[PDB]
Amino acid sequence: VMRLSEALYQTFFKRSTVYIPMLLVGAYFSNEAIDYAVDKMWTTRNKGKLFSDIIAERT
Amino acid sequence: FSFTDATVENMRGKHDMTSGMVAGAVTGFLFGMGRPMPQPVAWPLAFAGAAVAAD
Amino acid sequence: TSLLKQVALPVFNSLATTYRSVVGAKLAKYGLRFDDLQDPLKDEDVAEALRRLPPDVVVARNCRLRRALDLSCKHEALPKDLLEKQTPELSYLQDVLNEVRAERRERAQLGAPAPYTRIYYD
Amino acid sequence: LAWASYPYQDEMRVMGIKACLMISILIGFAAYSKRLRWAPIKSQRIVMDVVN
Amino acid sequence: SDAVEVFKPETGLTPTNRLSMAPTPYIKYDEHNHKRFPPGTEGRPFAYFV
Amino acid sequence: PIGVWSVFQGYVTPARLPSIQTLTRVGAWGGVVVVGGLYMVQPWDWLA
Amino acid sequence: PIGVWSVFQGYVTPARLPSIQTLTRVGAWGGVVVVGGLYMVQPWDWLA
Amino acid sequence: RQNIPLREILYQLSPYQQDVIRQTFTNAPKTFLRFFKEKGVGLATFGVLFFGIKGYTEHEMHQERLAERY
Amino acid sequence: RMHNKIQLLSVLNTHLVAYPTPMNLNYSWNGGSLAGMMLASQMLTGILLAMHYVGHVDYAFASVQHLMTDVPSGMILRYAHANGASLFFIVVYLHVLRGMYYGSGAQPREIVWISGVVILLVMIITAFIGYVLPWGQMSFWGATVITSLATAIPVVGKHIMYWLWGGFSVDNPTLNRFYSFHYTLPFILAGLSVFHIAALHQYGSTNPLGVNSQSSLISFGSYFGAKDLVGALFLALVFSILVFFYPDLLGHPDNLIPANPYSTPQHIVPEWYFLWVYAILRSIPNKAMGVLAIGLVFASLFAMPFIGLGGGKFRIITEWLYWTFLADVLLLTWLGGNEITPITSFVGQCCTAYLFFYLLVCQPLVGYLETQFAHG
Amino acid sequence: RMHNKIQLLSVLNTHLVAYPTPMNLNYSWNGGSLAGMMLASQMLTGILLAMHYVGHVDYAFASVQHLMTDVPSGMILRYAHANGASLFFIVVYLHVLRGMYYGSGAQPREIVWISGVVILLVMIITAFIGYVLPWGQMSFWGATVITSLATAIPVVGKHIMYWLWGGFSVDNPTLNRFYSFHYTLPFILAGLSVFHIAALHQYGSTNPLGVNSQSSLISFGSYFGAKDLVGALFLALVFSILVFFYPDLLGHPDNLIPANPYSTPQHIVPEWYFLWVYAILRSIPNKAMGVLAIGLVFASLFAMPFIGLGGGKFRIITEWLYWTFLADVLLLTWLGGNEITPITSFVGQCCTAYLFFYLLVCQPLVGYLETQFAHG
């Protein structure tokens, strides 16, 4: 039913030497997004208890 | 039903109607599993409705 | 022992029939028989009894084992029309295997070995 | 004193949250790639002359 | 070469012999685990993207 | 199976068991192990 | 007799040598190891 | 490599001509019930023996502690 | 064709890529790959920890602490090693229980079962001498209690005890020789695992049906690589949870006290994976009889392929008795962690007697009756 | 047959008892079994040594002294482990020179030669980092001079150097990680030795005549067991002489001084088996060019099965040139123990140039001329 596009296949999928650098940039951005989400959730939950909150409070 | 009710009770820290609805949904889904399909939705609704009427 | 061992045999027969009923109910869903549960690798007498058989019997046994293994991979059972036709207790091997084991017991009383060994690979 | 026994508990928990999320996504992706490879076998048709 | 001298089949209208002499184009696969796509579905598969 | 299945199938007979002379000559290796241990440890007052 | 013996005997002709397309497809692996090393180390904006 | 005499017709479909995980949601409650139907007796006898012997032992240990009191 | 030109490509292709395997193997056949992966993990993290550990009684605990706090990624490595030992024992115990359930040690796979029992004994010794290396209170006192079982042997007991200690008590030479033996024994485990796997490839694996499977075989590399990856990821999830969220859950708090030979703890207990052997030892009020009972347990494990009849699903009486055996070994695990008490002594004695009854009476005799029921 | 029923006995029989070997092999084919015996001896002595050695600064020297004077048979174990490295290198060097003389790496035994060169590199690294362990002046200063040679690679220099050291100078982290790496590397040596022997068994050994020997093959296990035992007894005589009569003859007296990072010795030279590489490095007045030449020697060693034409006798020009090569290598070994002098610099440069000339010009071109003379 759902099917990968031919023009998108001929560019990023037909050769491994083009597929691998695309894989590495996607891996970089996926790690950045996961880091951002985990850090935002942790800092939102534990607000007011961290050391940086005390330091920014003393300014 | 009783274990799911008291578990949601102790997890939420308060007594209200949500624990009964969740326990009813779990018990009715246990009853309704493996049956054709009005039933895996209809039986959680019936057991949750029994919990709501009880409250 | 002989006074109580006269009637200890019907109790054995009743337990054996109950056991075969339960296991044959388990076996029939896979299309298997009781004689298909014997492995030529596990027993050298069964390996000897299997080469004494006509080729169509061996072809049927291999077909049944292949069907059962395919059913086991698919996490399925036989359909109802096939399941009602299954005969789990129709023997094809017990006479030949009984003859093989009797021959081996006969050779052992005269100090002779069996004229075959285990299946050795590589 | 509880900090003194486990000085890196916060960093360990942040790393554990990231690891659990990543492994939970990878479990689904690996289950997908397992079922894709095993699909021609799980749906094969065998017809034989044996009825029993 | 002839199939009677090379494959050496049994004689009869068995289920395997019927498909050997005339195979059917209406092949039925098992669909308990996977439902097939409509036959002749073209295009590069979506599983590469996944 | 080969251990207890062979006893239960009646394949272990007196004519198939090893002889008493074979059991005597095989069991003579027990003195070799004793004298080997005495040679290794030398825990004796036997030399006098 | 694999190596210099192959070229002394005349077995390495203009034919049986890799084509330009084959060398380019093999030569395209040079960018992959560079990108992989830059991905592993990440020296961002380190180019002078 | 171990010639096996067999007569069959085998059919196989491409893995890009069928779905991958969509039937997994339909069969999941049935497989759960089938698993517990097949392994119900063994898990129950394990649970009965383990928890009964553990409970009897813990009860008699508590009685032993109470018997040492003054 | 390319693997036909080099030997190392051919051996790898035959035994990893194109090796035939039964198509109906379920997820109970993943314990071996997981055990191999856990051995590789233990070897890697141990090699990395050995660059910061010092095997001296004045610096062992302090170097452990310094590795925990000051070495970058040292806490991850130390917790990964200490909890990977427990996950290694979990995976191996489940592998052995799979073999006990299906009767996989039977002919023609007696060598596989025997090399497995050898592997398990080496694993037990490796973990026991590795636990002494932190030189905590449990590390000292468990080595004292267990190596004092050699005095149960008459005449030459104390001499063997003093030879193993290097002195009159557990002290620095014991720790140094334990460190050398502990570094060494995992490589013997790797060799034994290679031999154990190459023994199985002679005939192949058994299947969950318990029948001959030579008619339905598929390539190992294309199909069971992904199926092993799935189980490896489920194991990595549990490993991550244990390392990062509950790192001292499977440990003991007394091993964080430095060792004191003049004040014993109130409850000397081992790690959880030695608790059933410890319960067998504590249940019998005689040291020689307890050591003999442990040796007879392992002798019964060696003699399984020759006295055991009875296998998987279709052999239903032994299949039902398997769950009683499993409940018995978990009751032995629980009883080891509890103190000595008349009811725990009685229950441990009964549980040990039932383990011997199942191993030596149920497996031959009930197996023979069900073979006569099914094929007589 | 009894060996036909257990797969372990079949492999052992096939590869150690009934293996067909040429009957005209002389005593220069005993290098490999002697090298394996020396590897096993080093592993045994070291595993025994590690039960009394402490891998920490301010304990290492004292632990070696306590091993020497207080451990029963400890002096024998230490001197055996120290001189066994020298005898191991003597045997492996004579093995390599045999292979150079006879052209043993040619088709179809290129994998055997390549795995040998890999084994030699791992042996060199193992011996160097094991020489660091006693923590004397020679240990510290040799480890300083060699590891601070990564500042020849541009840009990525001192980063790699400081990551190797675990700090800013050779100190306790360097010694502590060198202990773990040195314990671990000989098991890789044993595995590579097993692979190396298994690669030879695919095609069997060459003979002193240099002709096909398939017509005249005899069993290994009867005829070449006693022949190996004779050479092993000669090696045991030399080993016993070195251990008991001249235990410090091959060493350096400066390694009996505790290491001082602020005072350097007058002459810093390695052990004798590293001296030819040291002379090649020290002769070239550039660090990066010296490391490039050292790498080029081993690259030319790897390329030898694909460029080297010419074997033993009946190829007489390359046979004569082998003795010039042997003299060149022994001269480089002598030059490494001297001081830096303009005449020694000139002679070392000429020796390095001739070594490259023989390895890269004489072996292909003179060998091709010999083939054109003999069969042209």
Ligand SMILES: CCCCCCCCCCCCCCCCCC(=O)OC[C@H](COP(=O)(O)O)OC(=O)CCCCCCCCCCCCCCCCC
């Ligand atoms: C005094 C000290 C007080 C301590 C209080 C805490 C003790 C422990 C907590 C309470 C435990 C009791 C309920 C445990 C339920 C666990 C789940 C379970 O059993 O399901 C498994 C299992 C589930 O099967 P599956 O779902 O098929 O796996 O359930 C069963 O099969 C039922 C098990 C019933 C057998 C155990 C009954 C309790 C034993 C008590 C024996 C007392 C003897 C008294 C003799 C002296 C009298 C004077």
Ligand SMILES: CCCCCCCCCCCCCCCCCC(=O)OC[C@H](COP(=O)(O)O)OC(=O)CCCCCCCCCCCCCCCCC
């Ligand atoms: C063939 C021989 C087989 C032998 C079988 C041996 C047992 C194998 C299974 C054992 C199951 C694990 C139990 C470990 C803890 C026992 C503690 C104990 O008895 O002493 C209580 C012990 C002391 O109690 P006290 O001395 O009585 O106060 O308490 C503790 O130390 C805390 C117990 C924590 C329990 C954690 C449970 C969950 C951990 C993770 C579970 C993972 C399951 C598998 C998942 C991975 C799959 C690959």
Ligand code: HEM
């Ligand atoms: C080449 C392989 C291995 C090496 C070099 C090694 C090394 C070490 C070292 C240096 C320690 C002390 C550091 C510490 O206590 O955290 C240790 C601890 C330990 N090792 Fe390993 N090990 C290896 C493999 C294994 C294996 C296969 C096991 C199997 C069970 C194991 C079990 C343990 C245990 C239980 C501890 C005690 C952990 C604790 O409670 O702190 N090790 N190992």
Ligand code: HEM
């Ligand atoms: C480090 C420990 C071990 C490793 C790496 C290992 C590895 C393996 C592997 C890869 C398999 C093939 C597939 C499988 O069944 O998972 C296997 C099978 C087997 N293992 Fe283990 N094993 C280990 C320990 C043991 C132990 C401790 C035992 C028994 C006491 C054992 C007994 C068996 C048996 C009987 C089989 C054949 C089962 C069958 O194919 O049905 N193994 N092993």
Ligand code: HEM
């Ligand atoms: C610990 C190190 C080594 C061990 C245990 C070892 C072992 C052996 C053995 C047992 C043999 C067969 C008997 C013999 O010809 O001596 C052999 C042959 C051979 N080895 Fe070694 N070897 C080692 C190192 C090396 C090295 C360093 C090289 C080369 C750089 C090498 C190259 C060869 C070659 C080419 C042969 C075949 C000789 C022929 O058949 O003409 N080996 N090796």
Ligand code: HEM
């Ligand atoms: C498992 C194998 C081995 C172990 C455990 C081991 C262990 C040790 C230990 C603990 C030391 C320091 C104590 C001392 O120097 O007296 C040492 C030193 C040394 N090791 Fe070994 N070793 C092994 C194998 C080898 C091998 C294969 C070689 C050579 C190729 C080697 C070469 C050396 C050398 C040259 C020294 C310096 C000895 C000295 O000058 O005192 N070792 N080794």
Ligand SMILES: COC1=C(OC)C(=O)C(C/C=C(\C)CC/C=C(/C)CC/C=C(\C)CC/C=C(\C)CCC=C(C)C)=C(C)C1=O
């Ligand atoms: C059908 O059945 C089968 C399986 O089941 C489904 C399998 O899974 C496998 C594959 C086996 C695996 C993954 C187990 C791993 C194997 C072993 C022998 C474990 C021991 C090996 C170790 C620890 C290697 C680590 C040591 C090294 C690298 C040496 C040191 C050197 C360096 C660090 C450089 C096979 C062949 C199989 O047929």
Ligand SMILES: COC1=C(OC)C(=O)C(C/C=C(\C)CC/C=C(/C)CC/C=C(\C)CC/C=C(\C)CCC=C(C)C)=C(C)C1=O
């Ligand atoms: C906290 O502590 C403790 C442990 O620890 C974690 C324990 O396990 C145990 C109990 C464990 C038992 C009964 C099972 C393991 C039993 C033994 C005997 C382990 C084997 C080890 C021995 C005999 C030590 C000797 C070492 C040798 C011989 C080195 C090996 C080298 C060669 C064979 C060459 C207890 C009580 C304990 O309180």
Ligand SMILES: COC1=C(OC)C(=O)C(C/C=C(\C)CC/C=C(/C)CC/C=C(\C)CC/C=C(\C)CCC=C(C)C)=C(C)C1=O
């Ligand atoms: C007096 O001075 C000198 C020494 O001193 C006593 C020497 O010895 C040497 C001899 C050393 C040479 C020729 C180089 C040795 C080779 C290498 C590659 C250097 C060693 C590399 C190290 C220690 C990097 C860290 C790696 C380790 C520990 C192991 C890596 C692990 C694996 C490969 C699995 C010379 C020349 C010297 O003049």
Ligand SMILES: COC1=C(OC)C(=O)C(C/C=C(\C)CC/C=C(\C)CC/C=C(\C)CC/C=C(/C)CCC=C(C)C)=C(C)C1=O
């Ligand atoms: C050209 O013809 C040939 C030769 O030339 C005549 C040879 O020489 C050899 C090879 C010689 C061999 C294999 C014997 C030499 C010994 C070696 C390599 C190892 C030395 C080991 C010893 C002395 C004992 C080791 C003891 C133990 C217990 C370690 C094992 C560990 C465990 C079991 C855990 C071969 C194959 C050959 O074709």
